[PDB]
Design a protein around this nucleic acid. Structure first.
Ligand SMILES: [K+]
Ligand SMILES: [K+]
Ligand SMILES: [K+]
Ligand SMILES: [K+]
Ligand SMILES: [K+]
Ligand SMILES: [K+]
Ligand SMILES: [K+]
Ligand SMILES: [Mg+2]
Ligand SMILES: [Mg+2]
Ligand SMILES: [Mg+2]
Ligand SMILES: [Mg+2]
Ligand SMILES: [Mg+2]
Ligand SMILES: [Mg+2]
Ligand SMILES: [Mg+2]
Ligand SMILES: [Mg+2]
Ligand SMILES: [Mg+2]
Ligand SMILES: [Mg+2]
Ligand SMILES: [Mg+2]
Ligand SMILES: [Mg+2]
Ligand SMILES: [Mg+2]
Ligand SMILES: [Mg+2]
Ligand SMILES: [Mg+2]
Ligand SMILES: [Mg+2]
Ligand SMILES: [Mg+2]
Ligand SMILES: [Mg+2]
Ligand SMILES: [Mg+2]
Ligand SMILES: [Mg+2]
Ligand SMILES: [Mg+2]
Ligand SMILES: [Mg+2]
Ligand SMILES: [Mg+2]
Ligand SMILES: [Mg+2]
Ligand SMILES: [Mg+2]
Ligand SMILES: [Mg+2]
Ligand SMILES: [Mg+2]
Ligand SMILES: [Mg+2]
Ligand SMILES: [Mg+2]
Ligand SMILES: [Mg+2]
Ligand SMILES: [Mg+2]
Ligand SMILES: [Mg+2]
Ligand SMILES: [Mg+2]
Ligand SMILES: [Mg+2]
Ligand SMILES: [Mg+2]
Ligand SMILES: [Mg+2]
Ligand SMILES: [Mg+2]
Ligand SMILES: [Mg+2]
Ligand SMILES: [Mg+2]
Ligand SMILES: [Mg+2]
Ligand SMILES: [Mg+2]
Ligand SMILES: [Mg+2]
Ligand SMILES: [Mg+2]
Ligand SMILES: [Mg+2]
Ligand SMILES: [Mg+2]
Ligand SMILES: [Mg+2]
Ligand SMILES: [Zn+2]
Lengths: 154, 305, 110, 219, 115
RNA sequence: CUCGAUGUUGGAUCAGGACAUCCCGAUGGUGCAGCCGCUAUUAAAGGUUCGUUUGUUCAACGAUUAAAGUCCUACGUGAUCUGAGUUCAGACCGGAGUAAUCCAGGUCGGUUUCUAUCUACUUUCAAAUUCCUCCCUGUACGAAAGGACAAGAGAAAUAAGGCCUACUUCACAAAGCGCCUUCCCCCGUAAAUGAUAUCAUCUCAACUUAGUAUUAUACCCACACCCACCCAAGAACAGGGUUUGU
RNA sequence: GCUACCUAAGAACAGCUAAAAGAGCACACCCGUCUAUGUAGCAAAAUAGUGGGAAGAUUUAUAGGUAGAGGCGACAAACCUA
């Protein structure tokens, strides 16, 4: 009866789950774009969002430094978190990462996803774009929208 | 041939516009039904013995404790009425049963996730679609025009009601949890047999009798709690305080009806009939209606003297 | 337990060829507008994603050459430049990665 | 600004309207019976109406060892030793039978729960039932009593040395050997405190509650 | 709270309940249909090799709110007619026992402290 | 019938059924005053305790209970479990035998396999049983002792179905030790009126009453958005939500 | 070349107590008490835990000896290539 369970069961246990996400999170910070199974990326995505929040607390905060020390197994990424990633999202209150589904892995046909930090220097992902406003359906709705605004003013 | 959804082909600009457009229409439709008595209401007959009125559909918010004037503690379940309207009325001849039926819906949901036949049913009625529809058996004199809103003041404190809802589904469960079997001991030699059913039948029959308790799906079925007393009525938020617990999880839609137990028969003399009309009420009801034995929050502390 | 009797092919065909065991035809397949290859509606295009990954791999190799070893992550932002391009005003003070090719059309400079 | 622990709802899928209406009933009760600020470890005297007691009024003095529950059902446990017998009563904050809640001594302890006082010496649970209240100076920090109790010989009611309890007010050196301390560390979970997704941030929740509390006082 | 094989502590000043013995007083039967004893329920004790009825006046198991909870399982020795064996009860007992003054009038008459 | 195998005690688990009824219901008789009993008719919906010794079925005993029913089901059920007993190979004691060895004599120890092909089954009913207290009442009854029934009130236990406000194991929730709800009838006889047989007669005479329910009612009830995401829904599938599709 | 026993010549046995030890606690090592799992298994006798011994009638490497009307046996009718 998994009613209200929000944490997945992965790895060899609870501690192994954290270490698996930590390695993915450490890889995500260094490369700013990684690919992994969809479930693990979705599980890791929540931690990536909160890691930036600790970066906004500043390197002078002992609690933030301790949290960054644990989750970044490579200590060269700790200066990057507080001096590159955190200043990057100074004007953003959320949505630090985007997660998209890529075709299944060739070996085990596993559901794969790609997660990246927004604003990276890497070439952009082929983001899905909505239909253009000049399509037949959108033109009809635009005409309907104009009619309502004109009637409202009158 | 490929499937589609409402906002598949919408542009970036249109999606906020469409959401605002349909949302405003739903609020306008709900606000248009606020005066049922000024839109040619059906005749209102006085209550008679043996007459059955309609119930409501309420959402289970949660549970809250209350104390009575004798010091006893009673825990009650909060049932909030959310967008409850009468949908369809079927005559006694056409009901194929012994009584006329009145269809009631609640908890307005999105039009984009409903069937075309359902959407056009609500288009004629002029209301946004309801998540759950329940059928209430009523007498002829209790008929209510479709589209009439229903409020939690339909019930009054001191009344006993029945609540029906789908119970919490526990999935596939063994006999120990589903049927409360004793199971087998944990030690003294037991070999891979601790929660197993054991014997399922006798050797002579050579078959398992139909209706034998076996592991399977547990819960997620409709159950009814009878004789739930109504302690408090909140007219502002349309909340019914029913005694004890009701089947189902929180935020689920329940079916509230007057109790069918013989001890509570013909107790609707002082209850509104066929329902409660706030627009036609001479004096506006107070925010909260309390039972005679309920300690109100503003009341002084209990003193035995 | 062991089977009491051999199951016939007529019985086996009904189980094996049941519609529950048959492959379901997918209806969420569409042509990618950028390249013309097929893709699913909720899945990124395989051809385009490989194109981005090929360019990403080249950029990451150039990053390692400048870093020249492990634990060499810079404390400044990174900008990728191609042939015939010069750093802009907003790109001053950032690590510069140079690629010996013309900038791809789909890789818009920011 | 002290917000009572019951006003802050636990994490869950309950509709916020249920909490808002439940808070309204709590506020209307607080203007009839004054509920003073107290923490776990404070000495409280509670006067309640008992239909069978002499004078129909009962008074119990003890140390608040646990505060738990939310909404109208919030409860606190008072522990005291009377005639050599340990007695605990779990009072309800919003029960109308409660006549008065008096804070004899407002203080905090090193732990959020003092359930281990059951396994401690009787001197740490014995308080005078007629002790005069201690005056608390206004606009002063609530005193923190860093007293560490001495435990009775094992076995205890619970394995208080385990890391999950996180107890700091017990003299483990006097009662436990180094080997037992090392054995208890086998259940330590270093990753638990660094699990970011398990954090419950109620700063925005508490901000909205205070607006509701301030609005009620005006009317 | 108190069931079969449960050791109890006698809180009255009776000689039987306070005389030293190599076996602690133990509950052998609870006069309830469910077999679980609470405050105010009579049980049978095998104390000093003898069978004596007792009245439960406190237990460690949590009960309803606003009711005391004791750190020991306390009983008072009573006769078959309900008259207590002892003469003074120094240990405090719950005030909820006063709803049974029709049958426990003499038991409450020797109780010095109510909690 | 089965030895090209139909696996034995007792226990655990789950119980199906019979009524020749232990308890609860309705009646007749009494050497039935009352309170308790005895006996017979009717009734199988519901229930039928926890322990010490013994491998035990039993039995004895302790404490209870409205009662601790009698039997069938391959002495129900080991492809669910147990292996104490029993029943291999070791050994001991008594006894039989020249010995090997034997003894419904005792005694200690002693491998319990099977991945389910087929049949059957996997949410039947959503009406509840019982005890105790108060009251009636120290009344009916009776020389006294003793001591009801019916009606009414209240509080519990068990069973069934749910739930998490608090307590508790716990902590986005699942749970009980916690809380909430739980509704009809039972046919044996006892009486009128009145024929065969002009009284009488409760009638496999016509008929009337206690005396009966089409078991009442309740529950369920509309349907391609559906690629995808979420879920108090779930093994998969299905189902709910997305007006919560960067 | 397994095992039973024997022959020639080798090897191993931490720490603590007692310091005398077919002595105690306890690794390596030897054995296989009890329970669970396993039962076409990892294994034609194992795994995990718990246990007996562990300076001795100990354990063990190498070569040799005793052969079926037999060997060998601190007798279990043991063991002598499942
Ligand atoms: K045979
Ligand atoms: K029966
Ligand atoms: K025995
Ligand atoms: K068959
Ligand atoms: K006759
Ligand atoms: K092996
Ligand atoms: K040889
Ligand atoms: Mg889940
Ligand atoms: Mg796994
Ligand atoms: Mg479920
Ligand atoms: Mg068990
Ligand atoms: Mg065994
Ligand atoms: Mg086995
Ligand atoms: Mg097992
Ligand atoms: Mg057969
Ligand atoms: Mg304990
Ligand atoms: Mg004796
Ligand atoms: Mg055969
Ligand atoms: Mg049996
Ligand atoms: Mg049965
Ligand atoms: Mg009979
Ligand atoms: Mg019969
Ligand atoms: Mg009955
Ligand atoms: Mg008679
Ligand atoms: Mg048998
Ligand atoms: Mg069988
Ligand atoms: Mg058997
Ligand atoms: Mg045996
Ligand atoms: Mg002999
Ligand atoms: Mg013989
Ligand atoms: Mg043995
Ligand atoms: Mg034997
Ligand atoms: Mg076997
Ligand atoms: Mg078996
Ligand atoms: Mg099986
Ligand atoms: Mg099925
Ligand atoms: Mg009576
Ligand atoms: Mg239950
Ligand atoms: Mg006549
Ligand atoms: Mg005549
Ligand atoms: Mg006559
Ligand atoms: Mg006559
Ligand atoms: Mg679909
Ligand atoms: Mg030699
Ligand atoms: Mg040594
Ligand atoms: Mg030795
Ligand atoms: Mg070896
Ligand atoms: Mg040996
Ligand atoms: Mg030794
Ligand atoms: Mg030879
Ligand atoms: Mg030997
Ligand atoms: Mg021999
Ligand atoms: Mg032999
Ligand atoms: Zn493409």
């Amino acid at each position: 009866i998994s009613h209200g369970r929000v944490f997945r069961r992965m790895g060899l246990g609870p501690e192994s789950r954290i270490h698996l996400l930590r390695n993915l999170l450490t890889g995500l910070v260094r490369h700013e774009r990684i690919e992994a199974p969809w479930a693990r990326v979705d599980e890791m995505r929540g931690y990536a969002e909160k890691l930036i929040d600790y970066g906004k607390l500043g390197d002078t905060n002992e609690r933030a430094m301790r949290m960054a020390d644990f989750w970044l197994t490579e200590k060269d990424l700790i200066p990057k978190l507080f001096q590159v990633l955190a200043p990057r999202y100074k004007d953003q209150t959320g949505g630090y990462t985007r997660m998209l589904q890529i075709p299944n892995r060739s070996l085990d046909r596993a559901k794969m996803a790609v997660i990246e930090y927004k604003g990276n220097c890497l070439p952009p992902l082929p983001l899905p774009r909505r239909d253009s406003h000049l399509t037949l359906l959108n033109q009809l709705l635009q005409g309907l929208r104009q009619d309502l605004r004109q009637s409202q003013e009158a | 041939k490929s499937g589609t959804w409402w906002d598949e082909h919408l542009s970036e600009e249109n999606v906020p516009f469409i959401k605002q457009l349909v949302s405003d229409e739903d609020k306008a439709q709900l606000a248009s039904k606020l005066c049922p008595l000024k839109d040619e209401p059906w005749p209102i007959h006085p209550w008679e013995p043996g007459s059955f009125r309609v119930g409501l559909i309420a959402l289970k918010l949660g549970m809250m404790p209350l104390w009575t004037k004798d010091g006893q503690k009673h825990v009650v379940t909060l049932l909030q009425v959310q967008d409850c309207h009468v949908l369809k009325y079927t005559s006694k001849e056409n009901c194929n049963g012994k009584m006329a039926t009145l269809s009631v819906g609640g908890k307005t949901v999105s039009r984009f996730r409903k069937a075309t036949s359902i959407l056009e049913f609500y288009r004629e009625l002029g209301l946004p679609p309801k998540q759950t529809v329940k059928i209430f058996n009523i007498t002829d004199n209790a008929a209510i025009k479709p589209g009439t809103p229903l409020y939690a003041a339909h019930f009054r404190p001191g009344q006993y009601v029945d609540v029906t809802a789908k119970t919490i589904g526990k999935g596939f469960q063994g006999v120990m949890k589903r049927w409360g079997f004793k199971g087998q001991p944990a030690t003294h030699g037991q070999t891979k047999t601790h929660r197993r059913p054991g014997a399922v039948a006798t050797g002579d029959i050579g078959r398992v009798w139909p209706g034998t308790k076996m592991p399977g799906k547990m819960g997620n079925i409709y159950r009814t709690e009878y004789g739930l007393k109504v302690w408090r009525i909140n007219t502002k938020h349309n909340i019914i305080y029913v005694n004890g617990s009701v089947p189902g999880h929180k935020n689920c839609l329940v079916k509230v009806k007057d109790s069918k137990l013989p001890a509570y028969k013909d107790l609707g003399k002082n209850l509104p009939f066929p329902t409660y009309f706030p627009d036609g009420d001479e004096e506006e009801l107070p925010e909260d209606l309390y039972d005679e034995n309920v300690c109100q929050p503003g009341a002084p502390s209990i003193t035995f003297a | 337990a062991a089977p009491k009797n051999r199951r016939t092919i007529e019985v086996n065909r009904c189980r094996r060829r049941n519609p529950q065991k048959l492959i379901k035809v997918k209806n969420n397949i569409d042509v990618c507008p950028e390249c013309g290859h097929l893709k699913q509606k909720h899945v990124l295009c395989a051809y385009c994603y490989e194109k981005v990954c090929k360019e990403t791999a080249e950029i990451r190799r150039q990053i390692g050459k400048q870093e020249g070893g492990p634990f060499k992550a810079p404390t400044i932002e990174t900008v990728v430049l191609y042939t015939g391009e010069t750093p802009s005003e907003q790109d001053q003070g950032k690590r510069i990665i140079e690629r010996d090719r013309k900038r791809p059309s789909w890789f818009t400079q920011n | 600004r002290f917000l009572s622990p019951e006003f802050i709802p636990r994490r869950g899928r309950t509709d916020p309207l249920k909490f808002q209406i439940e808070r309204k009933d709590m506020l209307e009760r607080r203007k009839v019976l004054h509920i003073p600020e107290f923490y776990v470890g404070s000495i409280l005297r509670v006067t309640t109406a008992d239909p069978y007691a002499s004078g129909k009024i009962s008074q119990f003095l003890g140390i608040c060892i646990q505060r738990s529950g939310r909404g109208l059902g919030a409860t606190f446990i008072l522990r005291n030793v009377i005639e050599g017998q340990g007695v605990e009563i779990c009072f309800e904050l919003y029960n109308p039978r409660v006549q008065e809640i008096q804070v004899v001594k407002l203080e905090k302890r090193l732990d959020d729960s003092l359930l281990y006082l059951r396994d401690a010496l009787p001197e740490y649970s014995t308080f005078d039932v007629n002790m005069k209240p201690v005056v608390q100076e206004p606009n002063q920090k609530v005193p923190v009593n860093e007293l560490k109790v001495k435990m009775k010989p094992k076995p205890w009611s619970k394995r208080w040395e385990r890391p999950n309890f996180n107890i700091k007010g017990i003299r483990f050196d006097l009662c436990l050997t180094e080997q037992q301390m090392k054995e208890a560390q086998k259940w330590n979970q270093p990753w638990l405190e660094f699990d970011m997704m398990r954090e419950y941030d109620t700063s925005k929740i508490e901000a909205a509650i205070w607006k509701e509390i301030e609005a009620s006082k005006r009317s | 709270a108190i069931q079969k094989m449960t050791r109890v502590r006698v809180v009255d000043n009776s000689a039987l309940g306070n005389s030293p013995y190599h076996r602690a007083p133990r509950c052998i039967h609870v006069y309830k249909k469910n077999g679980v004893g609470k405050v105010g329920d009579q049980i049978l004790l095998a104390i000093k090799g003898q069978k004596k009825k007792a009245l439960i006046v406190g237990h460690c198991m949590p009960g309803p709110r606003m009711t005391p909870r004791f750190d020991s399982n306390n009983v008072v020795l009573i006769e078959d007619n309900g008259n207590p064996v002892g003469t003074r009860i120094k240990t405090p007992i719950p005030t909820s026992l006063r709803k049974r003054e029709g049958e426990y009038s003499k038991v409450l008459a020797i109780a010095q402290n109510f909690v």
